[PDB]
């Protein structure tokens, strides 16, 4: 087979986050690298997880290819994983969806526009409506 031979090292139980952290080395002869989703799955059936409580980092491949090393977390369930893991990695793993925010510049510009407004503004809205409808 391909024989990734995924070995976990530096395993530490962290009940303070209800997860186990570790660094993981994968040996992939004649193969470019390892995909995050497949690596997360393999970590899941190694730890009897459910593929959703597993997060991965890095995997800086050595020179010439053949071996990748990166960080990894295996949790106890979905709930604490979703509460402890960052939104961007949630969007990567497909649990959540990217929030449609306006670009940072126009968000700031709109906020500065609202600074010039005291109160709700319906008063000046109907006043400029009267001025436009005089």
């Amino acid at each position: 087979s391909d024989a990734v031979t995924i070995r976990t090292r530096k395993v530490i139980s962290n009940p303070l986050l209800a997860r186990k952290q570790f660094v993981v080395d994968v040996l992939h002869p004649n193969r470019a690298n390892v995909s995050k989703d497949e690596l997360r799955e393999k970590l899941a059936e190694v730890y009897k997880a459910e593929k959703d409580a597993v997060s991965v980092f890095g995997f800086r491949t050595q020179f010439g290819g053949g071996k990748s090393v990166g960080f990894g977390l295996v949790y106890n369930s979905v709930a604490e994983a979703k509460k402890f893991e960052p939104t961007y990695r949630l969007v990567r793993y497909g649990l959540a969806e990217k929030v449609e925010k306006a670009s940072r510049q126009q968000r700031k510009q709109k906020k500065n526009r609202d600074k010039k407004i005291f109160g709700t503004g319906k008063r000046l809205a109907k006043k400029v409506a009267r001025r436009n409808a005089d």
Partner: protein
């Protein structure tokens, strides 16, 4: 200028935190607290850097605000809370406790104590003074004011706190031939037995300290911290016992461990 500062640039942080030079422009500025910021270990430095229970500051904040970590039995959700020397850190999980002491290499070390040791701490009397209504009090090094102390208690003496109530159980006088600890100067981390002390009126009394195998040195009285009598200390010692063996000697132990 114009007021108190809020930012601590990296490379201005105390070196014994052992912060790396890269991966950040700033350093955790410890909040106002029991310990001076030069000789205090912020909880973010102790968690992320010393214990590796968190990967980033956001995870540190997640650990702190859950009411996980209690410093001296109090939650202290502040990220940069200045935990200092002799402080007791209890974690709800893993059923284990840490005491904060320096190592002989002059930096705070992860030292694991039991629950009975975590149930108390030793502090150094900074002053003895009569307060309002004539109640006497002792001020420890960690800014603890305890009312009605033993009359025999004098300045630079050691008092054992109960850590669940603000009382003193017993004390050690500052006398010759008592095991001490060093918390300042180039001798940061040493453990030895007193020889004598020089009078030196007007400021900066000097104390002569002898190690276990006769490594005699001197230091200011400000840095001395009595921890017990000959042997049988009141505090379990960290790994090393603060001896400062020579560079060649630790080279021998290293080549012994890896060269078998």
């Amino acid at each position: 200028a114009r007021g108190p500062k809020k930012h601590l640039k990296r490379l201005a942080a105390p070196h014994h935190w052992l912060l790396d030079k890269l991966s950040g422009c700033y350093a955790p500025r410890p909040s106002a607290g029991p310990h001076k910021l030069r000789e205090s270990l912020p909880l973010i430095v102790f968690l992320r850097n010393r214990l590796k229970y968190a990967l980033n500051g956001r995870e540190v904040k997640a650990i702190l605000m859950q009411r996980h970590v209690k410093v001296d039995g109090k939650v202290r959700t502040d990220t940069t809370y200045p935990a200092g020397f002799m402080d007791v850190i209890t974690l709800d999980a893993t059923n284990e406790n840490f005491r904060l002491v320096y190592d002989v290499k002059g930096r705070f070390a992860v030292h694991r104590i039991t629950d009975e040791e975590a149930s108390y701490k030793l502090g150094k009397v900074k002053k003895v003074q009569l307060g309002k209504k004539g109640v006497p009090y002792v001020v420890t090094h960690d800014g603890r004011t305890i009312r009605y102390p033993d009359p025999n208690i004098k300045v630079n003496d050691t008092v054992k706190i109960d850590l669940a109530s603000g009382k003193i159980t017993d004390f050690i006088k500052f006398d010759a031939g008592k095991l001490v600890y060093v918390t300042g100067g180039r001798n940061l981390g040493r453990i030895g037995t007193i020889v004598h002390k020089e009078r030196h009126d007007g400021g900066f009394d000097l104390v002569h300290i002898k190690d276990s195998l006769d490594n005699t040195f001197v230091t200011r009285l400000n840095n001395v911290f009595v921890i017990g009598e000959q042997g049988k200390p009141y505090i379990s010692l960290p790994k090393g016992k603060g001896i400062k063996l020579s560079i060649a000697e630790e080279r021998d132990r290293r080549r012994a461990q890896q060269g078998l």
